[PDB]
Design a protein around this ligand. Structure first.
Ligand code: ATP
Ligand code: MG
Length: 842
């Protein structure tokens, strides 16, 4: 009885009126009632509390007197000081009130019965108090809100508009918005960085096919058994108090894992590859959230004795270390130590064990008669890299007698890229669920890549295109790849363009931040020094220079694979260690921290550093191989690459930028100073087919300027230049926006202008062209200063003067008129009109 279906037959429309919001509401209420939801009339919170009282008394087999019920209400159900986050805490964690009655007896009052899910009462009400809405009540509590809109209302624009009193609606867990054609759901959270339209979701089948229209969505997502499982078992409330409602592919993998455990155990078919399986969920789609959730659910199987959740120490960061601290405290870090692991093994009244693959492998090497070897064990592995996982499989196959193991990866091991390691299929067995990169990009759940070799260094181009590895390793020195000029030109390019790439030029726009991945410890030292020197230079030239805050971290290591670096700082050579030492000193003075480079300090520095790159206390992080495979930073959008990446390491590193955020983060920028074009196509193609690169890789500057057709859709996209031309041709101004119609058409057109400029801000050709508009062509020093900073010659310089762009004045005239029209939105038809709210606020 899976809740993400393998097969689904589309319902038929009634033939009745299905245009207005009250049309959608009629059929939704009717459909929900056919599915066992009792409709009640509720006109007040007083009537809501009364209904809650009836449902919780039924559920819990107990009758409150009135004084008790008022007390229950003021102190647990409906505390006046509770906010949304407090009700989510109560739904997901604190759902049992141990209540003391007037006669002093003690009873557990459940808000929700989680073990007997179907015992919960589900009800529907319509909106009471202009807005058409239906609310699903679970034991009288409002947990879902369905916002209904007219057909042909832009669902996105409606979302922007709506995202005490009455306080019971703080309990809402889930939103659904629908114009009948499209239906999206999203979590009720106060975290604004999770509140953008990018975080709404379509329901779907296990093959990932969308289920969009409200009638089908009603009959699938809104089956009591579906919706209640989504609400209770497939929504995560983490240690940072963020509610995340899982996407269908995440749920689809999870339930298929659990069902596979049970049928294997019932078949007494354990400890073979046909006992478990793997999940192919593409990089950045939620493997770490999902696999961890599936491990937590697995502990609720009464016949399993211990569930191992295994991560790679390479992949740890602040948020996930905070998470794991709650379940396996002081045990999930970067050290080789197993004391914490073996202590959590001995904890009774506990089934989940989080650990790293380095630790699990160490313990299994040294220990031989652990009780857990003969128990019923689930293994859930979250992207464990090739070399350490290989030795761990040997001892696991050797020593666990009754296990069911599962793996999540975004970059499987096929015959073609095996050389050395066992294929993913041979280790884990069947592919239980797949959600691949073209799946995720079509669903807009990860971001595309803009990948460009920055070929502006002729003296060094020969090296930066070298392909023999022997030669490439031999060029990691100051005569070649670490030539001070090359390091300077590259570092200068990054300082001249960081704000352009991260969307920080036109303030007070927050923007994004970036990483720089390099080839070696010496490379990191040269770059950190050059940045330092070049920024002290800029501080003297201009006194209005605003510096970037730069940091680095690395230790010592040891195709496709990114080298594993140890957390044992005593492994490094004296020079690397004293450099990393001096960097932490500067880091300490700035952030008023006090980390050292002993093991404990380095580990805490690593943990602080991840936090500050994620929240942009750091502008640019320089690494060799750390934070390249698991680090989750939605507001990081640019990876500067001076490194030879291939195959799965390529996919992982680039994907540091691939997190969706809002409409300002159109894709991740990958700026490379070695030519990685062949490697990018080879790596994309290895994890898809020959067409996959056309979905993953962004179009050229000429395409966004002049227009193209998205082959994935058939959607013609107008070019910037066509838009700009239409703006002048049809709106040379103020009299052009006289009539309502002309106002609507202008908003539509200027919205495309804003989408196109924001895309084009990531193209060096466009930044160069914008820069030229701010120049005295008579002034020859500033003409020469622009040529050298944008790498244009006298020929290229000639051509760009001919490209006519609209003046800053006419743009800000467009901008404020656009705002007028937006704020006025309090014959002609405004429903389909999406204002570009995020791009504005930028
Ligand atoms: N269902 C969801 N709802 C809301 N947010 C989500 C959901 N799934 C993933 N995210 C967000 O997307 C980001 C990436 O998730 P996560 O790091 O678990 O992915 P991953 O696949 O392990 O990535 P990597 O391949 O880089 O290790 C996180 O910030 C996460 O909170
Ligand atoms: Mg991960």
């Amino acid at each position: 009885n899976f809740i993400v279906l393998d097969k689904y037959i589309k319902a038929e429309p009634t033939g009745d009126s299905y245009q207005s919001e009250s049309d959608l509401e009629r059929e939704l209420i009717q459909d929900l009632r056919n599915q066992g939801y009792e409709f009640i009339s509720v006109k007040s919170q007083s009537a809501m509390l009364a209904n809650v009282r009836e449902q919780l008394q039924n559920l819990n087999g107990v009758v409150f007197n009135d004084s008790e019920w008022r007390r229950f209400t003021e102190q647990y159900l409906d505390n006046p000081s509770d906010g949304i986050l407090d009700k989510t805490r109560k739904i997901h964690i604190d759902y049992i009130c141990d209540f003391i009655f007037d006669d002093e007896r003690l009873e557990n009052i459940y808000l929700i019965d989680k073990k007997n899910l179907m015992r919960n009462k589900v009800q529907i009400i319509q909106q009471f108090e202009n807005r058409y809405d239906v609310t699903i009540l679970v034991n009288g509590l409002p947990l879902v809100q369905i916002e209904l809109k007219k057909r042909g209302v832009a669902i996105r624009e409606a979302f922007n508009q709506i995202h005490s009193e009455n306080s019971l609606f703080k309990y809402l867990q889930l939103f659904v918005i629908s114009n009948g054609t499209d239906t999206r759901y999203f979590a009720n959270t106060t975290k604004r960085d999770k509140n953008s339209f990018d975080f709404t979701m379509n329901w779907a089948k296990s093959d990932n096919t969308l289920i969009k229209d409200l009638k089908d969505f009603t009959a699938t997502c809104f089956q009591k058994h579906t919706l209640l499982n989504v609400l209770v078992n497939y929504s995560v409330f983490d240690s940072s108090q963020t509610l995340l409602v899982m996407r269908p592919y995440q749920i689809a993998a999870t339930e298929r894992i659990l069902w596979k455990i049970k049928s294997s155990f019932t078949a007494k078919n354990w400890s073979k590859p046909e006992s478990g399986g793997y999940i192919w969920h593409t990089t950045g789609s939620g493997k770490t959230l999902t696999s961890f959730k599936a491990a937590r659910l697995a502990t609720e199987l009464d016949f399993i004795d211990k569930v191992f959740f295994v991560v790679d120490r390479k992949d740890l960061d602040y948020q996930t270390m905070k998470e794991y601290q709650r379940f396996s405290p002081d045990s999930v870090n970067g050290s080789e130590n197993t004391a914490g692991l073996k202590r959590n093994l001995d904890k009774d009244d506990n089934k989940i064990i989080v650990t790293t693959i380095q630790k699990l492998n160490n313990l299994m090497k040294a220990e031989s008669d652990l009780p857990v070897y003969n128990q019923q064990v689930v293994f859930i592995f979250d992207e464990c890299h090739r070399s350490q996982f290989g030795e761990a499989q040997k001892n696991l196959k050797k020593k666990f007698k009754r296990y069911y193991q599962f793996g999540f990866t975004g970059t499987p091991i096929f015959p073609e890229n095996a050389l050395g390691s066992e294929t993913t299929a041979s280790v884990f067995g069947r592919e239980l669920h797949s959600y691949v990169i073209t799946d995720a990009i079509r669903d807009e759940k990860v971001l595309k890549f803009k990948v460009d070799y920055n070929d502006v260094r002729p003296q060094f181009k020969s090296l930066e295109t070298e392909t023999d590895e022997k030669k490439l390793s031999a060029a990691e020195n100051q005569q070649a790849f670490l030539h001070p000029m090359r390091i300077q030109e590259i570092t200068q390019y990054i300082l001249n363009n960081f704000r352009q790439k991260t969307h920080r030029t036109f303030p007070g726009s927050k923007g994004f931040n970036a990483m720089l991945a390099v080839s070696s410890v010496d490379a990191a030292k040269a770059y950190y020094a050059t940045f330092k020197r070049l920024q002290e230079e800029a501080a003297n030239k201009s006194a209005t220079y605003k510096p970037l805050r730069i940091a680095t971290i690395f230790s010592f290591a040891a195709i496709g694979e990114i080298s594993d670096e140890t957390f044992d700082t005593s492994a490094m050579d004296s020079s690397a260690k004293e450099f990393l030492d001096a960097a932490i000193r500067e880091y300490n003075s700035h952030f008023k921290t006090n980390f050292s480079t002993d093991s404990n300090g380095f580990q805490n520095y690593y943990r602080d550093l991840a936090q500050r790159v994620k929240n942009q206390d750091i502008d640019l992080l320089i690494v060799v191989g750390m934070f390249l495979t698991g680090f989750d930073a939605p507001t990081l959008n640019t990876l500067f690459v001076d490194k030879n990446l291939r195959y799965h390491g390529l996919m992982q590193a680039f994907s540091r930028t691939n997190r969706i955020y809002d409409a300002t983060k159109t894709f991740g920028n990958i700026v490379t100073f070695r030519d990685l074009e062949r490697s990018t196509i080879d790596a994309i193609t290895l994890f898809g087919d020959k067409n996959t690169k056309n979905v993953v890789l962004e179009k050229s500057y000429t395409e966004y300027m002049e227009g193209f057709t998205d082959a994935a859709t058939g959607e013609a996209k107008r070019g910037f230049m066509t838009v700009v031309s239409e703006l002048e041709q049809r709106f040379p101004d103020p009299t052009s926006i006289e009539s309502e119609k002309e106002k609507k058409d202008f908003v539509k057109l200027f919205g495309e202008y804003l989408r196109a400029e924001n895309i084009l801000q990531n193209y060096d050709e466009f930044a160069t062209l914008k820069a030229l508009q701010q120049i005295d062509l008579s002034d020859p020093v500033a003409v020469e200063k622009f040529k050298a900073e944008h790498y244009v010659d006298d020929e290229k310089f000639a051509e760009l003067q001919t490209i006519r762009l609209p003046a800053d004045r006419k743009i800000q005239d467009y901008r404020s008129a656009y705002n007028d029209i937006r704020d006025w939105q309090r014959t002609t038809d405004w429903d389909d009109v999406v204002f570009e709210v995020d791009l504005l606020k930028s």
